[PDB]
Write an enzyme that holds these catalytic residues in place. Structure first.
Site, PDB file in Angstrom:
ATOM      1  N   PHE A 160       7.913   0.598   7.592  1.00 17.63           N
ATOM      2  CA  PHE A 160       7.704   1.746   6.582  1.00 17.63           C
ATOM      3  C   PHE A 160       6.001   1.974   6.593  1.00 17.63           C
ATOM      4  O   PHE A 160       5.614   3.032   6.796  1.00 17.63           O
ATOM      5  CB  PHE A 160       7.875   1.126   5.158  1.00 17.63           C
ATOM      6  CG  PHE A 160       7.324   1.974   3.866  1.00 17.63           C
ATOM      7  CD1 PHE A 160       8.165   3.230   3.771  1.00 17.63           C
ATOM      8  CD2 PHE A 160       6.181   1.812   3.228  1.00 17.63           C
ATOM      9  CE1 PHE A 160       7.834   3.986   2.772  1.00 17.63           C
ATOM     10  CE2 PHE A 160       5.906   2.485   2.360  1.00 17.63           C
ATOM     11  CZ  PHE A 160       6.770   3.492   2.019  1.00 17.63           C
ATOM     12  N   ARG A 172       2.442  -5.253  -8.651  1.00 17.13           N
ATOM     13  CA  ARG A 172       1.929  -4.955  -6.994  1.00 17.13           C
ATOM     14  C   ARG A 172       2.214  -6.455  -6.482  1.00 17.13           C
ATOM     15  O   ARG A 172       1.410  -7.267  -6.687  1.00 17.13           O
ATOM     16  CB  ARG A 172       0.509  -4.608  -7.070  1.00 17.13           C
ATOM     17  CG  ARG A 172       0.201  -3.298  -7.694  1.00 17.13           C
ATOM     18  CD  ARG A 172       0.985  -2.038  -6.609  1.00 17.13           C
ATOM     19  NE  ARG A 172       0.375  -1.164  -7.296  1.00 17.13           N
ATOM     20  CZ  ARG A 172       0.507   0.189  -6.599  1.00 17.13           C
ATOM     21  NH1 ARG A 172       1.419   0.336  -5.590  1.00 17.13           N
ATOM     22  NH2 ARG A 172      -0.291   1.147  -6.902  1.00 17.13           N
ATOM     23  N   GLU A 214      -6.958   2.635   5.737  1.00 20.90           N
ATOM     24  CA  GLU A 214      -6.916   3.352   4.771  1.00 20.90           C
ATOM     25  C   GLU A 214      -8.184   3.841   4.123  1.00 20.90           C
ATOM     26  O   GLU A 214      -8.913   3.031   3.801  1.00 20.90           O
ATOM     27  CB  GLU A 214      -6.057   2.529   4.007  1.00 20.90           C
ATOM     28  CG  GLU A 214      -5.597   3.258   2.776  1.00 20.90           C
ATOM     29  CD  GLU A 214      -4.997   2.353   1.388  1.00 20.90           C
ATOM     30  OE1 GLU A 214      -5.410   1.278   1.546  1.00 20.90           O
ATOM     31  OE2 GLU A 214      -4.203   3.108   0.587  1.00 20.90           O
ATOM     32  N   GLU A 271      12.389   5.658  -6.921  1.00 19.68           N
ATOM     33  CA  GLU A 271      11.489   4.931  -5.865  1.00 19.68           C
ATOM     34  C   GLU A 271      11.424   3.368  -6.285  1.00 19.68           C
ATOM     35  O   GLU A 271      10.309   2.865  -5.742  1.00 19.68           O
ATOM     36  CB  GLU A 271      10.221   5.697  -5.750  1.00 19.68           C
TER      37      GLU A 271
HETATM   38  O1  LIG Z   1       0.682   3.877  -5.887  1.00 17.27           O
HETATM   39  P1  LIG Z   1       1.101   3.865  -4.329  1.00 17.27           P
HETATM   40  O2  LIG Z   1       1.481   5.075  -3.999  1.00 17.27           O
HETATM   41  O3  LIG Z   1       1.882   2.595  -4.256  1.00 17.27           O
HETATM   42  O4  LIG Z   1      -0.190   3.225  -3.421  1.00 17.27           O
HETATM   43  C1  LIG Z   1      -1.593   4.120  -3.653  1.00 17.27           C
HETATM   44  C2  LIG Z   1      -2.673   3.332  -3.536  1.00 17.27           C
HETATM   45  O5  LIG Z   1      -2.657   2.145  -4.654  1.00 17.27           O
HETATM   46  C3  LIG Z   1      -2.377   1.003  -4.140  1.00 17.27           C
HETATM   47  O6  LIG Z   1      -3.325   0.127  -4.257  1.00 17.27           O
HETATM   48  C4  LIG Z   1      -2.102   1.101  -2.818  1.00 17.27           C
HETATM   49  O7  LIG Z   1      -2.348   0.156  -1.782  1.00 17.27           O
HETATM   50  C5  LIG Z   1      -2.879   2.372  -2.187  1.00 17.27           C
HETATM   51  O8  LIG Z   1      -3.961   2.113  -1.594  1.00 17.27           O
HETATM   52 MG   LIG Z   2       1.409   5.205  -7.563  1.00 21.15          MG
END
Ligand SMILES: O=P(O)(O)OC[C@H]1O[C@H](O)[C@H](O)[C@@H]1O
Ligand SMILES: [Mg+2]
Ligand SMILES: O=P(O)(O)OC[C@H]1O[C@H](O)[C@H](O)[C@@H]1O
Ligand SMILES: [Mg+2]
Lengths: 204, 204
Positions: free
Chosen positions: A22, A73, A133, A156
């Protein structure tokens, strides 16, 4: 003053995919100039490749309120009291999209929110010793009275709860460690440094 | 108020390491409570695992100056004008080490700096949708007139240059995007919010 070297001073020789899923993990092979005047040998570094993100701080300038979104998370688990975090609206930027496109789509999908005016905050590298990133933060004008309930796309496996706090309360939560993810810390410290002028601009 | 669920509300079914080199790419499989009641099905997430870091903002309260370190971060290349970044001192926390011990050691190894007093800033998750990494930031009292030269373990392909600038210039570089890595943005925003009190505290 400032940095010493540019892209003229580094050559990326090759990139190799170490893990393809992914997300990906790539090996960059490169040489670069040294501060002492020489050139390095060929160096390799592992780099986590996961695309780039848009982040929205939803701020109600009339009420002086901030909208937060809560969701699990699992990567936070090992170092946090709970893997459920309080965050900014955010999502990945797909090919050809603008930061604003993404911020507006995510504000609706994650928080049920329409967004008015928007201004950039900052764009930052999350952890550039190991990942490429970049995250680009906007502040977006919202009516926090319309921010409530459970959102996220269940297709999702996204389950998100909206919270509304005052700006002062959100910043207190940063100070106390209750909000402790980079995007939210950066956005809320920025808001503490800029709220007076921002509220004046958006309530004229 | 605040977050809704705790570690009692998530079951991590399995973890696997899919790639192990300098860093690791792990897969977590888990189920968790849903805001509207009940439990999710099994969810899988890839997680970039690189351990956790200590960060030090070197601040000279007499001079109102900060010490920055410059080095290449090839991961920045694709989204930045140059991969050489201006950063806070930082390094990995090994088993049983404290944030403070690591921060003080890295200040000497990366910038040649002895550190006096320290105070915590914040501890944050770099990007918790995709990496477990946590970074814990301290501010450290330094004599910036002693900050000079080129550092790093050349055996570890590490080449670092020390810069001294005023706090005001460092913060303006955050505003301008010339400093745009999370640890430095968070630390310098914090400093902009706290420097008046910190200078009074450290110059009695
Ligand atoms: O909300 P998601 O689409 O999962 O991810 C957006 C960002 O927020 C989260 O910390 C992720 O690590 C990305 O940096
Ligand atoms: Mg998000
Ligand atoms: O200085 P290093 O030991 O390479 O890495 C320390 C931290 O600073 C860099 O941004 C990395 O991404 C880590 O988060
Ligand atoms: Mg370092």
């Amino acid at each position: 003053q400032g940095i010493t070297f540019s892209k003229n001073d580094v050559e990326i020789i090759a990139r190799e995919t170490l893990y393809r899923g992914f997300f990906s993990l790539d090996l960059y092979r490169f040489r670069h100039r040294l501060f002492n005047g020489g050139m390095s040998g060929e160096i390799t570094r592992e780099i986590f490749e996961r695309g780039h993100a848009a982040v929205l701080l939803p701020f109600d300038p009339v009420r002086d309120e901030v909208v937060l979104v809560e969701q699990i998370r699992i990567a936070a688990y090992d170092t946090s009291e709970s893997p459920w975090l309080l965050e900014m609206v955010a999502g990945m930027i797909e090919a050809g999209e603008t930061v604003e496109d993404v911020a507006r789509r995510e504000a609706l999908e994650e928080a049920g929110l329409e967004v008015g005016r928007t201004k950039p905050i900052l764009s930052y590298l999350a952890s550039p010793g190991g990942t490429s990133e970049r995250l680009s933060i906007l502040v977006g004008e919202v009516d926090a009275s319309t921010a409530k309930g459970i959102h996220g796309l269940a297709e999702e496996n996204e389950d998100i709860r909206v919270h509304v706090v005052s700006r002062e309360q959100a910043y207190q939560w940063v100070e106390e460690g209750k909000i402790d993810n980079a995007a939210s810390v950066i956005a809320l410290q920025w808001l503490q440094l800029h709220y007076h002028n921002l509220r004046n601009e958006w309530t004229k």
